[model samples]
Target: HGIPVSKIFFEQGTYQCLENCGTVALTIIRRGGDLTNTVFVDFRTEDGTANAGSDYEFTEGTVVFKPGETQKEIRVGIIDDDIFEEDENFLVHLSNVKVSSESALACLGSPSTATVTIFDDDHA
Candidate 1:
């Protein structure tokens, strides 16, 4: 039997980025738990043809949710470059979740990471 575990996941597993930027949200869910404590997670950027500080802004490492709150978003900044590059992508990972305290932890939800595909629409 499974204990009541809190889960964390991305709102969407995949996303397409058009124009200059795009946005995505991650969700922390209470599958079955006290759901009565603050939760926090740290995320980082990994490039896949899409580099940070250029294709997107570097996101802060941590995201926080109060006892009742569940969602937060990251903004991807698409740089306007004139080229017919195939496509670009970036990865975001979720980690360090907790319930009552850091020692007593919650669980990470489905697909703990997200893949964002940046479409090269500005090519000519």
Candidate 2:
């Protein structure tokens, strides 16, 4: 028997950005924003060799999906650095999921957390 479960998944896995470059978009798009009650989800960002304030900045927040809203974008800023190194990575994850109703679901396809790569393009 298959249990019916509503879920939200990340649209993309990795965002490639160049260092010393302008801030880029890093976000997670979710599905099932059509539920009767608003779905509440929380996410946080962690540094994966790419330290915050230096290589990148962590922007983690909750997304509110109305009845007809089907997509949510969570964005973060990546700071440019002068040091050139291998591609750096920062991680973001969705947690503390609270659905307005029982019919609501959590992250589906991607199962939440993923790595965002920031490439050092320090050509200075």
Candidate 3:
């Protein structure tokens, strides 16, 4: 049988950049069994737009989880330079979650979500 599950929601953190310079840091958490099978965490914009693809994606290669644990946490940092502009209203997606075994995969569970906002430091 699959493991019982629950979903937890976190407040979204927001950040702003001075049109040319700034950085933002955010953390995502996935809780439940068979987390080791998680492959990718997809990030998308909350606003209905094609920009959804521009959000960040955290793959298993970049994720770190404790051994034999049911919960995993990932931290992501984004920097904005003169080449790009900073914006608010972004969402994150956790995808490709799988378990080591088919039974485990069936036992695989869903994930909770959290958002972080970035702001321009120059405004201060």
Best by lDDT: 2
Give the total clashing residue pairs for model 2. 5
Instruction: Name the better of 1 and 3 by lDDT.
Output: 1
Compute the lDDT for candidate 2.
0.69
In candidate 1, the residue pairs with backbone N, CA or C atoms under 3 Å apart (3 or more residues apart, or in different chains) clash, namely 8-109
| lDDT (Cα atoms) of all candidates against the true structure | 0.68, 0.69, 0.37
Worst 10 residues of 3 by lDDT: 48-57
lDDT of 3: 0.37
Deviation of model 1 at 95, angstroms: 1.1
In Å, residue 120's CA in model 1 sits off its true spot by 0.7
* Per-residue lDDT of candidate 3, residues 44-89 (tens digit): 3343211332433232223333334433444443433333334444
lDDT leaderboard ranking = 2, 1, 3
Write model 2 residue lDDT over 56-117, tens digit each, in one string.
77677888777656677766787865665778888888776666754335444564777788
The TM-score leader among the candidates is 2
TM-score of each: 0.78, 0.79, 0.42
lDDT of 1 by residue, 9-35 (tens): 777887776644555444434344545
Better of 1 and 3 by TM-score: 1
Task: Tell me how far candidate 2 lies from the true structure as C-alpha RMSD in angstroms.
Answer: 2.9
- Per-candidate Cα RMSD to the true structure, in Å, reads 2.8, 2.9, 6.2
